[PDB]
Structures are given as structure tokens and as C-alpha cells.
């Protein structure tokens, strides 16, 4: 073996990863789309992100 390794220490980084939403269109017959992701945590503040998607119209 190598060495028994239990919970030595927790990882830092952000309080969590970013939320990945799907591109929900506004119009079926081609239109704009939106996306929103939020980040929360103990010390991490409520970070909000709102992006815009585009329909391919294939």
C-alpha cells in the first residue's frame, strides 16, 4: 500500500461551483434565450449571473 489517508483537511476554493442552467428560449419560432447561475456559501456572497443565449434556427 501507500498510507492510510482519512480526512486530513478540507479543500478551500469557493463555497461551491457555479450553477449551469440550460438555454431556455423565449420564442419557439426562433428567439432569444436566457441563463442564470448563482453562487452561495458561508463567506461567499450571493453572486448572481444572467446570460443570454441564441437559437440556431436550424
Amino acid at each position: 500500500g501507500k498510507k492510510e489517508k482519512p480526512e486530513k483537511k478540507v479543500k478551500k476554493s469557493d463555497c461551491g461551483e457555479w450553477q449551469w442552467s440550460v438555454c431556455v428560449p423565449t420564442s419557439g419560432d426562433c428567439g432569444l434565450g436566457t441563463r442564470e447561475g448563482t453562487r452561495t456559501g458561508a463567506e461567499c456572497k450571493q453572486t448572481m449571473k444572467t446570460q443570454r443565449c441564441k437559437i440556431p434556427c436550424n
Partner: protein, 194 residues
């Protein structure tokens, strides 16, 4: 090339000439702080009929909003914001009217009352504007937008999310206070970081 911003002001008979003045003060002041080197403006007034005051092609010749907004008079009538925005996407944002292709097109609507007497609905107009990629912002002014049932129509005129494209004001004078947020949210092409 940069952006094509069109202003849609209501000319209904409910708005008094003194308040209609506050509206033209707003659009001209907003037009100035948003006057870029590749940004053109267009404005169409609506009630039951529609009157274009200036298109992007002529704003390029005369980039002074105060001289094109000053001679603007009221039309008087009811509200036809549905058929109005429809004409914007087809006429105001038309290439032959000075509208550029591949340029960011943003539309702002200022109304005081719920759509009454309009033969067209939002379902027959909005999905069209969404296709061409025209992003909208709406400003609610008056008692007509104090109820959440009326606010819904504002959320239909503007683009999602409503908490980003829907502004509400109690009086035409208080429009000066929303000029700041409008300017920032119209320049924000994407969600920046802190």
C-alpha cells in the same frame, strides 16, 4: 454597426401635455448619455396611429436629439403598443431606414396605460421581435401599472428576465432617477464580475 436604439413613446390622451414634456426631456437626456460614435437612434410615437419622428438614417445626419425631440407633439387617442412595436421591428429597424445589420438592436417602450383597443396582441408581435434578436426594456408610468396583473404585460413587452428589463415609475418627473440604471443596463452587454 455598434447598436441601434429605438425609443417608443406613448401618445395616448391620458398623458397631459406637461407630463408629455417630461417624457421628451427623458428621451433626449437619455439619448445624449447614450450617444456613441456608431450608435444611432430612432423614435416612433403611438396611440391608435403611428408617427415616426426620425429614423437612424437621419439621426446620422443630425446627431442632435434635442432638435429632433423638441418639435414632437402629442397624437391623442388610446394605446396600440402591440401594433406599434410590430412596426418598429419591420420599419424602424429596416435597412432602408438607416438600421444597420449585425448591430445590437435595443428597444425601449414608455407607456402610461394598459393596451386598449389594439387589434393585435403581444403573442403576434413579441415572438417576432425575439427572432430578429431585438432586446427590449419597458418603463411603466402611472396607476395602470400598480397591479401585478398589469405588470405581467410589461414582462411580455420586455425581454427576460423582468427583474432586468422592467422599470416602474410613479410619475414622469421621477424618470430622471431611473436614467442611471437604464444607462448602466443598456451598456452591459454581458454579466460582468465584481
Amino acid at each position: 454597426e455598434d447598436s441601434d436604439i429605438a425609443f417608443l413613446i406613448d401618445g395616448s390622451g391620458s398623458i397631459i401635455p406637461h407630463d408629455f414634456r417630461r417624457m421628451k426631456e427623458f428621451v433626449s437626456t437619455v439619448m445624449e448619455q447614450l450617444k456613441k460614435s456608431k450608435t444611432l437612434f430612432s423614435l416612433m410615437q403611438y396611440s391608435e396611429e403611428f408617427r415616426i419622428h426620425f429614423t437612424f438614417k437621419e439621426f446620422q445626419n443630425n446627431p442632435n436629439p434635442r432638435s429632433l425631440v423638441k418639435p414632437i407633439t402629442q397624437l391623442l387617442g388610446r394605446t396600440h403598443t402591440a401594433t406599434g412595436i410590430r412596426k418598429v421591428v419591420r420599419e424602424l429597424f429596416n435597412i432602408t431606414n438607416g438600421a444597420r445589420k449585425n448591430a445590437f438592436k435595443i428597444l425601449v417602450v414608455i407607456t402610461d396605460g394598459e393596451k386598449f383597443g389594439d387589434p393585435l396582441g403581444y403573442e403576434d408581435v413579441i415572438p417576432e421581435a425575439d427572432r430578429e434578436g431585438v432586446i427590449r426594456y419597458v418603463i411603466g408610468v402611472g396607476d395602470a401599472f400598480r397591479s401585478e396583473k398589469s405588470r405581467q404585460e410589461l414582462n411580455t413587452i420586455a425581454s427576460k428576465p423582468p427583474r432586468d428589463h422592467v422599470f416602474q415609475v410613479n410619475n414622469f418627473e421621477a424618470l430622471k432617477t431611473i436614467q442611471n440604471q437604464l444607462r448602466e443596463k443598456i451598456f452591459a452587454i454581458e454579466g460582468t464580475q465584481t
